[PDB]
Design a protein around this ligand. Sequence first.
Ligand code: MET
Length: 531
Amino acid sequence: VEKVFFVTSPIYYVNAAPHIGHVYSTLITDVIGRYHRVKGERVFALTGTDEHGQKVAEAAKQKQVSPYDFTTAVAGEFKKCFEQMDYSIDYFIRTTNEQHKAVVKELWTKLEQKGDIYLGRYEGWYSISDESFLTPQNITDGVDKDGNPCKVSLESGHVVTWVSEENYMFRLSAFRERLLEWYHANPGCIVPEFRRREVIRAVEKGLPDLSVSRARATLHNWAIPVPGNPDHCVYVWLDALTNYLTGSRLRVDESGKEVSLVDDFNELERFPADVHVIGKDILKFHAIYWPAFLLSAGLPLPKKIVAHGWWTKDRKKISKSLGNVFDPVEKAEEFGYDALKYFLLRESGFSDDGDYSDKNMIARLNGELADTLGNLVMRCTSAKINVNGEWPSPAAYTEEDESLIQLIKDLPGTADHYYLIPDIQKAIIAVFDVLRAINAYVTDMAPWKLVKTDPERLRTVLYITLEGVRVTTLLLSPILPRKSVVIFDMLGVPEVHRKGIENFEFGAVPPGTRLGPAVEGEVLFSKRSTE
Ligand code: MET
């Protein structure tokens, strides 16, 4: 099937200002989308804000302003932040959007007509902060923000409350066997694998029916009314998951504004998502509830859900009051945007709860970006080594020449597989193994000596080096979107060769291609001191 590659981030609660967790999640979404665009594919990358619910409504009561003004303010902060992070997102969705509401009502009605929604009661624990139902097995003792004894989530640590309400219930219990068929039929549908094992384990134990409405007062009327029952509002999560569907059905103008909701998802060829990027904290919603709603509705299921871990700074929690902040924009201004992105994508894989420190950030920037990549780019383009300022024509290749050429020929196939898992960390490591190899080849050949001694040999060494740089840079362009453009400018790679699987091929830029012009003091990544 040939379709728009559809990649999504979670839509984030707007109870509070955007922070690193959100930036990271969206960054992951952005990178995947960026990579599929360089393969020449149509892409629709989606992010947004989850704006209804008790959590958000109460967050706005605390700051003492209307939910409409509050959600709009905070959403504005999310957009401003993401614009500043210089992503390439195709649309920003807000669940307050009127067309989103229509799609929710449409899906709800499908589930009802299917016979999968009945009137019942939920009597059990709820975490408002997580907007999540919990069994007693998943709560424990703790202290509220007074210090008085309460119950809290084992998952999250937030206060839980007992809820006893007549609610509309989705028949999730009836989807146990089909969800199990699905997980087993598509053993790559949840990444990383140990999270796939989590979901299976959980669904194996058994599934209770799920409350998909709440009484309207409980939600302070800040939700979507249940169609046909104005006393009930639709569960914030059923509403929020529907954003993926809504997004697949919106025609967007050049300004980034929704202008039309199509009746059928096929019209736009986006749905279902090829990758839902998420955090591990919201796995059940995406891997259990969502495919269950889609099965009931008769909709296609997503191809992959990839769930990453949580961040710490200096081996502690990120928190304003505890005195340990990590501001992505602040660190980008300090170290650079592409560098910070490299770090967050390099320093941790999706199975790990990684760690930012200034020390280790500077170690990677200097180590990998400046010495390994940065220096290689400057040398092979320098007037000292590349005296004619062009891509030379290679002479005959030695076996050592060819060992390196093989590594470069093999790199795209390997990096491709990693980006498709997806495992962005592994893709980066693969590209830098090839970069380390190029540097060691250069050390061996000492092109600086060859310039005097053997210009004919230099032609070969220099051409291999330029091409190795070009290919590695191409495959890193989704990680270093701005720096890759600079690198390609220095190399003098024509625009047409900066994109497309055609240009993953060794030798796509011809000898004789001229290098771009130099500047007095220019440097790709400048070293920074340690303390
Ligand atoms: C459909 S994704 C919803 C995610 C939720 N709003 C959160 O911030 O965790």
